[PDB]
């Protein structure tokens, strides 16, 4: 029944101080155990950062010790990481985790991009089912999510209703330095017109939420 959840800024500018917070549900930070921060360089392995005990004591990975502090707010059942003077090497997914002799419960992770650039919401274009997708049994349709920064973007279909057959691709970098991805779904050709398909895109750093409906 334990839940951990990381919250923080998805974007931080170089040399600034990165600040993350973990909120624990269903167990008290004060009772027992050591509460940890771990990060994961994109497309790479995991690095242990440090912990704060139930007692408030702390220990850190020497590779980052001189730039970090961990601390807690017992009255909110939160504990936090602060990483000072960040660079691009500190771009990673950051994980909250409990250590009971081992890491049992983890948070979902938040991605942190260290960049000088400004947040940019995405354009959303429909991927239109053309007549050859139509003539067979099944037809393909989707959403193109273009020109955004930073990661990540969140796509669903019909607000969660549609899951089967849905492929949301990994974002690719464009030569414009901006991200772009596609999300596509396979559906029975007969249901077109009968059934409406909307892709629900959410890009939090630009506070963008689009709901484009795809028809031909």
């Amino acid at each position: 029944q334990v839940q951990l959840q990381e919250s923080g800024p998805g974007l931080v500018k170089p040399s600034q101080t990165l600040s993350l917070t973990c909120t624990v549900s269903g167990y008290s930070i004060t009772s027992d155990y050591a509460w940890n921060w771990i990060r994961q360089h994109p497309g790479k392995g995991l690095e242990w950062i440090g912990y704060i005990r139930y007692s408030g004591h702390t220990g850190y990975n020497p590779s980052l010790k001189s730039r970090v502090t961990i601390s807690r707010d017992t009255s909110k059942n939160q504990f936090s990481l602060k990483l000072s003077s960040v660079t691009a090497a500190d771009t990673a997914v950051y994980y909250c985790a409990r250590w009971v002799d081992y890491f049992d419960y983890w948070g979902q992770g938040t991605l942190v991009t260290v960049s000088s650039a400004s947040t940019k919401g995405p354009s959303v274009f429909p991927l239109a089912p053309s007549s050859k997708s139509t003539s067979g049994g099944t037809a393909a349709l989707g959403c193109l999510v273009k020109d955004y920064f930073p990661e990540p973007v969140t796509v669903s279909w019909n607000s969660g209703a549609l899951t089967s057959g849905v492929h949301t691709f990994p974002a690719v970098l464009q030569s414009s330095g901006l991200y772009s991805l596609s999300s596509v779904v396979t559906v029975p050709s007969s249901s077109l017109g009968t059934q409406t398909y909307i892709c629900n895109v959410n890009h939090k750093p630009s506070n963008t939420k689009v709901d484009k409906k795809v028809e031909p």
Binding site: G45, L46, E47, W48, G59, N61, P62, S63, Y95, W99, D101, Y102, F103, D104, W106, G107, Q108, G109, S123, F125, P126, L127, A128, S130, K132, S133, T138, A140, G142, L144, K146, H167, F169, P170, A171, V172, Q174, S180, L181, S182, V184, T186
Partner: protein, 216 residues
Amino acid sequence: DVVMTQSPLSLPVTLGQPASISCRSSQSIVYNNRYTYLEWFQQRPGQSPRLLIYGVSNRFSGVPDRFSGSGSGTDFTLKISRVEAEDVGVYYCYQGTHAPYTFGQGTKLEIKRTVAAPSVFIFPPSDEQLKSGTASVVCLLNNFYPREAKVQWKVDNALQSGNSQESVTEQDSKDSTYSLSSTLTLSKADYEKHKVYACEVTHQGLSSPVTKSFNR
């Protein structure tokens, strides 16, 4: 520091067959001869790591009993008796004995399965995207195996190069196939200049290359 070394780095496994992952620490990670702090985690794409095994041999509650861990000293091992489709992911070992606590570099579990030809679709750019000045044409390759595919773009029978980028999904947790998108990006300017837009897929599952196209 203590260096955890895993082997192999990528591990192909026929579905339903066994698999074993070796993790070797550069020093002893036994605490006092009383206990050894070694864990095994599984990480599925886009998810936080999941605990599988703690203290070398103990299976975490909830973990399917086809997972087991063993070893002692500097040489440990994780085993899957019968691999199932959802087992696909990356697996890390972790030493909690000597600070700074460290992870392995990960072993990627790839599921081998029978060759599967892709279902190909082509998408012409939305009217909307066109007004805004650019043209993105999308070719979808859906549910295929193996990963290696060759997508060639041909505009009015002329072969493109340097103006398209691919994106590939991870192995599907159910059917172990891949999906791929190739996006051709052109200025609205360079787009009107041509009529025939072709996508030519070459894959093991196809006897002859498949081409999906359109005009405008």
